[PDB]
Amino acid sequence: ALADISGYLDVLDSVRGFSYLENAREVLRSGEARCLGNPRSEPEYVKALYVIGASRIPVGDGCSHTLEELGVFDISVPGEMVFPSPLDFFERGKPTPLVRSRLQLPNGVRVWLKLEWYNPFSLSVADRPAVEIISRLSRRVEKGSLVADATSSNFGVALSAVARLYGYRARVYLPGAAEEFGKLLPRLLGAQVIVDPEAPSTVHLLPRVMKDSKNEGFVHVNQYYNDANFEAHMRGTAREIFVQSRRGGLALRGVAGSLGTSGHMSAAAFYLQSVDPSIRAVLVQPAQGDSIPGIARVETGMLWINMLDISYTLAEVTLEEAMEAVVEVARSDGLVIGPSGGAAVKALAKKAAEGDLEPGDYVVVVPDTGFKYLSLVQNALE
Numbered sequence: 001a002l003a004d005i006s007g008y009l010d011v012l013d014s015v016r017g018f019s020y021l022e023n024a025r026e027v028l029r030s031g032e033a034r035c036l037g038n039p040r041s042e043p044e045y046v047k048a049l050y051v052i053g054a055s056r057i058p059v060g061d062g063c064s065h066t067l068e069e070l071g072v073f074d075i076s077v078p079g080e081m082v083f084p085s086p087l088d089f090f091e092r093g094k095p096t097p098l099v100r101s102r103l104q105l106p107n108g109v110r111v112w113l114k115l116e117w118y119n120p121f122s123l124s125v126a127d128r129p130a131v132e133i134i135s136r137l138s139r140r141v142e143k144g145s146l147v148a149d150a151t152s153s154n155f156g157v158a159l160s161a162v163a164r165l166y167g168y169r170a171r172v173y174l175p176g177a178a179e180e181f182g183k184l185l186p187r188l189l190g191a192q193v194i195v196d197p198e199a200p201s202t203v204h205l206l207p208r209v210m211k212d213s214k215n216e217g218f219v220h221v222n223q224y225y226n227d228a229n230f231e232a233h234m235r236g237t238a239r240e241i242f243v244q245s246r247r248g249g250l251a252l253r254g255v256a257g258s259l260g261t262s263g264h265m266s267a268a269a270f271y272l273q274s275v276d277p278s279i280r281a282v283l284v285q286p287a288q289g290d291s292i293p294g295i296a297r298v299e300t301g302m303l304w305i306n307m308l309d310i311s312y313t314l315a316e317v318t319l320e321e322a323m324e325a326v327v328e329v330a331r332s333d334g335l336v337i338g339p340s341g342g343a344a345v346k347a348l349a350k351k352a353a354e355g356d357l358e359p360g361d362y363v364v365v366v367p368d369t370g371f372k373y374l375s376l377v378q379n380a381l382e
């Protein structure tokens with residue numbers, strides 16, 4: 001028997017750990033899940049179902065229900081694209097677009113582009129963690145409290161818009177080298193914003209955010225460590241690849257992406273590799289000395305890409321190379337991607353070049369619009 005999952009979403013404030021994900025891998029790999037006689041005695045299982053994007057849970061004595069029965073494949077989007085609020089537009093106006101590129105890579109490597117700038121608050125992938133974190137937070141923290149964190153840019157914009165739609169106050173902390181939209185947009189959205197000229201990278205800002213949090217009593221929502229960030233991308237970004245690939249007719253053979261916290265490619269890779277372990281995750285290690293805004297090298301410390309059981313390859317990419325690839329997607333497809341997007345296009349293009357990749361469909365996750373990166377656009381043409 002099928003019942004509604006909303007009711008059982010207290011397991012989000014009770015399950016801790018990753019042992020619950022073993023349940024995910026089996027439900028996904030099997031394509032079904034066993035019915036639960038007592039839904040409250042199985043907090044791990046229930047949580048797993050939510051995290052793969054079920055809307056319902058299977059309840060009863062011995063039965064089982066498919067992914068489609070559970071609602072992994074439910075279409076959310078109103079055909080007409082009419083939404084009674086912005087927050088509901090984020091929720092139900094999904095999946096973000098998967099667009100097949102005219103870009104031609106060798107060895108029959110077919111490039112598809114998941115356009116995460118089609119998120120309403122930050123025009124970036126960072127909306128999805130920011131709604132998931134703040135939504136859970138609304139359960140426990142009182143309204144009018146200040147929530148805060150460090151960001152390269154996207155998440156601080158997403159945090160500020162969403163915090164303020166949930167009644168919470170916002171502080172964002174940015175490194176000096178980040179972009180003007182990040183420093184400016186939160187303020188337009190009513191946050192306080194603090195910029196450290198000395199801080200060369202976002203992870204380096206963390207001690208300052210932690211110190212101030214202890215002194216001031218704001219809630220440091222902490223995207224690097226906060227398990228919702230991984231979980232948002234499991235029920236949203238990753239699940240969508242799973243669904244779209246199937247409904248799209250895609251022979252899905254892999255994913256390509258970029259890493260800051262590692263939330264979204266950890267989630268795409270794990271989800272996808274639960275359904276089918278052969279799927280490569282091609283990931284980008286920005287080259288040494290170069291800065292690509294939004295992302296970093298793994299060995300600067302990342303939670304999920306390390307600890308979860310994820311087969312992934314790295315290709316090195318310079319900024320200059322990430323920018324070359326922006327330029328060529330823009331001449332191929334006429335779509336203008338951000339620097340981190342072109343870094344994952346480039347990184348796939350090399351494994352393709354090398355002959356390390358099977359013939360088939362690859363989905364790249366493009367994290368934001370190039371319209372926010374005019375300087376790096378300009379410099380890449382001169």
Ligand SMILES: Cc1ncc(COP(=O)(O)O)c(/C=N/[C@@H](COP(=O)(O)O)C(=O)O)c1O
Binds near residue numbers: 156258259367368
């Ligand atoms: C443009 C762009 N490209 C890639 C990423 C990487 O996504 P993640 O692995 O899910 O954090 C992000 C994620 N952004 C967050 C996290 O950045 P950080 O992890 O501190 O390097 C921010 O803006 O501060 C991004 O904005």
